[PDB]
Amino acid sequence: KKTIREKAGWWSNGGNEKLSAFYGPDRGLWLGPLSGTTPAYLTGEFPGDYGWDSAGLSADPETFKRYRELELIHARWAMLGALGCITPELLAKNGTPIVEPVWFKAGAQIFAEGGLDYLGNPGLVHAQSILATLAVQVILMGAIEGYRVNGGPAGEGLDKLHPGGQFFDPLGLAEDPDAFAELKVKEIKNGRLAMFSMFGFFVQAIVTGKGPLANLDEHLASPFTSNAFTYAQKFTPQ
Amino acid sequence: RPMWYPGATAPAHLDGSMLGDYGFDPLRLGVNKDNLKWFREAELTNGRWAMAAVVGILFTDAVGLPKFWTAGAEKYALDNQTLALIEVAVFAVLEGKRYEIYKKTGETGFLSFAPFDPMGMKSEEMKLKELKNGRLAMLAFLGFCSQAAVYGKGPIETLQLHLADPGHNNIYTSSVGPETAVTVAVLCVLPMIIEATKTLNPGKESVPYFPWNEPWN
Amino acid sequence: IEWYGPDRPKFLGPFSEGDTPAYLTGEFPGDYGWDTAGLSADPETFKRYRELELIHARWAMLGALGCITPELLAKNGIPFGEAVWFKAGAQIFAEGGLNYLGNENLIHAQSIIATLAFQVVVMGLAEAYRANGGPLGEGLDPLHPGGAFDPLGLADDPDTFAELKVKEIKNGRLAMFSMFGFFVQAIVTGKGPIQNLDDHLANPTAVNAFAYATKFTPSA
Ligand code: CHL
Ligand code: CLA
Ligand code: CLA
Ligand SMILES: CCCCCCCCCCCCCCCC(=O)OC[C@H](COP(=O)(O)OC[C@@H](O)CO)OC(=O)CCCCCCCCCCCCCCC
Ligand SMILES: CC(/C=C/C=C(C)/C=C/[C@@]12O[C@]1(C)C[C@@H](O)CC2(C)C)=C\C=C\C=C(C)\C=C\C=C(C)\C=C\[C@@]12O[C@]1(C)C[C@@H](O)CC2(C)C
Ligand SMILES: CC1=C[C@H](O)CC(C)(C)[C@H]1/C=C/C(C)=C/C=C/C(C)=C/C=C/C=C(C)/C=C/C=C(C)/C=C/C1=C(C)C[C@H](O)CC1(C)C
Ligand SMILES: CC1=C[C@H](O)CC(C)(C)[C@H]1/C=C/C(C)=C/C=C/C(C)=C/C=C/C=C(C)/C=C/C=C(C)/C=C/C1=C(C)C[C@H](O)CC1(C)C
Numbered sequence A: 001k002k003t004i005r006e007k008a009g010w011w012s013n014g015g016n017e018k019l020s021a022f023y024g025p026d027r028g029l030w031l032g033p034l035s036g037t038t039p040a041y042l043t044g045e046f047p048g049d050y051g052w053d054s055a056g057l058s059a060d061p062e063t064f065k066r067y068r069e070l071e072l073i074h075a076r077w078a079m080l081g082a083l084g085c086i087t088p089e090l091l092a093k094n095g096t097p098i099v100e101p102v103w104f105k106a107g108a109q110i111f112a113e114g115g116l117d118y119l120g121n122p123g124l125v126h127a128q129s130i131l132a133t134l135a136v137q138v139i140l141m142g143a144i145e146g147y148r149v150n151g152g153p154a155g156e157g158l159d160k161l162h163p164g165g166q167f168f169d170p171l172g173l174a175e176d177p178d179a180f181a182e183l184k185v186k187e188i189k190n191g192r193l194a195m196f197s198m199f200g201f202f203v204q205a206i207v208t209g210k211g212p213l214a215n216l217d218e219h220l221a222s223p224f225t226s227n228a229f230t231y232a233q234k235f236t237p238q
Numbered sequence B: 001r002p003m004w005y006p007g008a009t010a011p012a013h014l015d016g017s018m019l020g021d022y023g024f025d026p027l028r029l030g031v032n033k034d035n036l037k038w039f040r041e042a043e044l045t046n047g048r049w050a051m052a053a054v055v056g057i058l059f060t061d062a063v064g065l066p067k068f069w070t071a072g073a074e075k076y077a078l079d080n081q082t083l084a085l086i087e088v089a090v091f092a093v094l095e096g097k098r099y100e101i102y103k104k105t106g107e108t109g110f111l112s113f114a115p116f117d118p119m120g121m122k123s124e125e126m127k128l129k130e131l132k133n134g135r136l137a138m139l140a141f142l143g144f145c146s147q148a149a150v151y152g153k154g155p156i157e158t159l160q161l162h163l164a165d166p167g168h169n170n171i172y173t174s175s176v177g178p179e180t181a182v183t184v185a186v187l188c189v190l191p192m193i194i195e196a197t198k199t200l201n202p203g204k205e206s207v208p209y210f211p212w213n214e215p216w217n
Numbered sequence C: 001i002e003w004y005g006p007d008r009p010k011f012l013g014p015f016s017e018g019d020t021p022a023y024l025t026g027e028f029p030g031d032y033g034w035d036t037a038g039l040s041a042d043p044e045t046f047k048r049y050r051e052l053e054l055i056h057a058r059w060a061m062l063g064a065l066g067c068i069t070p071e072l073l074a075k076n077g078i079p080f081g082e083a084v085w086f087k088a089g090a091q092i093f094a095e096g097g098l099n100y101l102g103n104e105n106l107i108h109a110q111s112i113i114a115t116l117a118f119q120v121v122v123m124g125l126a127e128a129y130r131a132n133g134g135p136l137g138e139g140l141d142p143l144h145p146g147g148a149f150d151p152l153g154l155a156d157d158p159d160t161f162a163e164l165k166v167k168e169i170k171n172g173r174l175a176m177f178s179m180f181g182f183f184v185q186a187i188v189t190g191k192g193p194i195q196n197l198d199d200h201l202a203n204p205t206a207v208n209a210f211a212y213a214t215k216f217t218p219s220a
Helices: A059-082 A087-094 A101-110 A132-149 A178-208 A210-222 B033-062 B081-106 B124-149 B155-164 B179-201 C042-075 C087-093 C111-132 C159-189 C193-202 C209-215
Strands: none
Touching: A059 A178, A087 A101, A087 A210, A087 C193, A101 A178, A101 C209, A178 A210, A178 C087, A210 B033, A210 C111, B033 B124, B033 B155, B124 C193, B155 C193, C042 C087, C042 C159, C087 C159, C159 C193
8 A cells, every 4th residue: 555665765855654553552562462451541542552550559640640650750769770780880891990890799899998989080070088079978868859740940730740841851852742652652661671681680780790781791701501591599498 | 443453444344333333444354244243253153252361371371281282291190082072072062052052143152052151241332342451361361371482480480580570571581582583563553554545545455466355346 | 736627737847749649638637649550539537547557556555555664674783584585485394384474473374375275365355345346335437436435535526526536646657667667677676665765775875776787688
């Protein structure tokens, strides 16, 4: 019905049927063609709506709103965390002299008497007091999150999840409402992937005990040799 | 209004409409209005960067830090190519927002605040002060680099050298002494030739026959 | 300070005008406007959660006092074969059993199964009576029955009743927080609460929790 170059995905700014796979009735669902009866409250109006409420926890619209905000905030924090749990180890295996690049050991760097050099450079942050660090952090993050929940110096009458003034959308990527609608989906999908992968970081720490990039490397060395089933008998009750 | 030399007559395009207008366009680089606006913005951008650079150099030479023409050679937390890549990536978006802001506003902005003016101090007196301090700081950085290339000393060390013997430790006793003396004399006698041109052709403007000027119109 | 209505104190203080939900009217004690998770949007679930909060609060107050008291009495002279609270239960397996205040003549419990059996019998009776009433009440409030549970009569005035409700739920939230702390810092430290305070007071800057931070690292 179309020509070759429209099939091949040319001609940007033809997007109103491309939101159909992420919003609306006939969108992609959590079990795909094997998920018939989506919850009636998951109408397809919000980003990331795949019809997954098996436990019915979001049946109330207001708790659904609160859960959406929880999801997006967790997603953003988990994206930052997934990037930050791999950046030091990547940089250390590329050769930056980070003293403890593994993430679940990265907090114990501040107890070495050379302090917490940021990239392993003593001329950088050079933090020694974990208590002063925590105090600074508590003050700043309390101000920050209280500003988030009602408003602050960066806009008060803005949305609770996507404020998008000149402080939180300073590149203007989301001025087109369709670009905004699909970027919301990209945000929530990358964020759900990051939350799953951060759960994976947690479990791979508690189970394996090495770094996540070290786990990737020892899996790529001999995958069938070394897997999560290698550590299946680790939590044996003795 | 004051001019760049006493009793000068500004060209036809330097109407005084702009700030810092002293009628100085002898090569007639700004006879086009779009070019003149772009050049005002480039003047201000080079001036802001030169102000920041002048204060940074004065700071790093006031304290026990390496000299500014060697600071790039020192060792840092990141290798120079990673620094260059992060700088390119950051400044692509930064100068892109600034370019959009120039195309819209005609003036400067950081990313999304078209005027970066949290503290609302955007007078036109303040624009004039920005422009004048920026010209002064552009000259100041040019001098920093020039008298750190002539000598191997920083700005305030060359200043101390001048103050130790002002009559014998100056630019006209340096390696660039005679060329600068000659260019200064030429500059001081230049405005009399320009005023001869203004005098013998009363109220007429002469095109200097340059490419950018389109002098045939 | 009001503690009720729209101009009540709230859990983010000045930051709290637009975070509170529409359903958290300042009607119930301790309503600081904290339902970020929206778990109390349904009024019935809200009522059940209020009951859970208050019962956990009362049990946690009793338990906080019961974990603090024997240790205080322990250093203040009294024999306590096992004073620390997270081993106070293992006294049954000792030679002389669980003597109450160290007195071999007070209780002298030797069998944990019989102790537990009596406990289930009377706790079930009492909690069933709590749910649906009994010898100390027929149709009273599920949370503030009164009558048999006000022999002193502190809360016959509604305003005193309200302020004491707030005091109750707040001391109880404090005790629940403190009991959670007891748990986590017993698991982390392995010592009692009073000894943890003594150690923190002996060297506050290097005897805090961060000294036990690298304790649970897997390390292959
Ligand atoms: C404007 C300043 C102000 C700020 C920032 C807060 C903030 C808070 N109040 Mg609040 N209040 C404030 C003013 C007032 N409060 C109150 C009355 C109350 C009450 C009654 C209560 C609060 C509570 C809270 C907390 C609810 C949010 C939360 O649970 O954090 C959650 C986020 C975290 C816990 C992050 C952790 C922070 C810290 C950095 C942890 C360190 C990280 C660890 C190392 C991680 C451990 C690693 C593990 C995983 C291995 C929060 C700390 C509630 C509370 O105490 O709950 C805890 C509560 O019950 N406030 C009054 C009286 C009217 C105020 C007056 O202005
Ligand atoms: C405002 C800028 C400024 C200032 C305050 C100075 C000041 C100084 N320079 Mg530098 N210099 C400058 C710009 C400046 N220069 C520029 C643009 C160049 C490139 C041509 C140089 C190149 C240069 C060399 C090569 C040498 C100096 C030297 C000197 C010292 C002796 C004066 C002299 O002979 O130079 C005269 C400078 C010029 C002829 C260049 C033009 C200067 C312009 C016209 C600005 C004049 C000052 C301005 C009107 C008002 C000053 C503002 C305020 C600070 C009071 C003195 C510390 C000498 C030195 O260090 O001796 C130990 C030396 O050897 N300078
Ligand atoms: C009000 C209740 C309360 C009180 C008085 C204490 C008091 C104490 N705790 Mg306990 N604790 C509590 C609640 C409390 N905790 C809770 C709720 C938890 C679970 C998260 C813990 C988990 C915990 C652990 C795992 C350990 C302690 C330890 C300690 C002792 C050292 C302090 C320390 O490391 O801080 C740790 C405090 C916390 C982890 C969270 C409590 C939050 C407080 C009440 C709010 C902040 C108030 C503070 C003064 C402001 C600081 C600002 C800035 C520096 C952050 C000290 C006697 C350590 C110990 O035994 O040392 C001898 C220890 O190993 N506590
Ligand atoms: C210090 C070194 C010596 C510097 C000498 C002076 C430099 C001249 C700089 C000119 C800037 C651009 C002029 C703006 C243009 C402008 O203002 O237009 C004015 C004029 C033509 O006017 P138009 O009629 O096109 O103008 C109409 C429009 O303005 C619309 O009204 O320009 C020319 O005639 C052509 C000039 C070409 C100049 C560029 C030549 C390239 C030289 C390099 C050669 C390299 C060869 C080797 C390759 C490996
Ligand atoms: C002098 C200057 C421009 C002078 C222009 C003049 C006179 C123009 C004159 C004319 O055009 C007109 C008006 C009209 C025409 O008809 C006639 C002429 C005559 C043609 C610009 C300087 C412009 C200067 C600028 C932009 C300086 C930026 C400096 C930076 C970034 C410094 C960075 C660092 O030094 C630090 C800070 C620390 C170090 O360790 C690292 C590094 C990187 C080395
Ligand atoms: C949907 C549904 C449906 C039905 O109905 C029901 C159900 C099932 C329930 C549901 C589901 C759900 C889910 C799955 C969830 C999940 C979550 C997660 C995973 C999260 C994470 C989450 C995650 C996260 C936040 C993360 C974060 C992170 C971070 C901060 C980080 C930090 C850090 C880093 C950087 C590193 C350094 O060195 C250290 C640290 C400090 C460590
Ligand atoms: C509000 C909100 C809001 C949003 O929306 C959401 C969320 C977040 C979810 C929420 C929150 C919540 C929380 C925080 C909770 C907590 C809880 C707790 C802590 C409890 C405790 C609790 C606690 C408790 C009970 C306690 C108890 C105690 C007891 C019994 C004791 C006992 C004992 C003792 C004496 C000692 C001895 O030797 C023995 C024993 C036997 C051991």
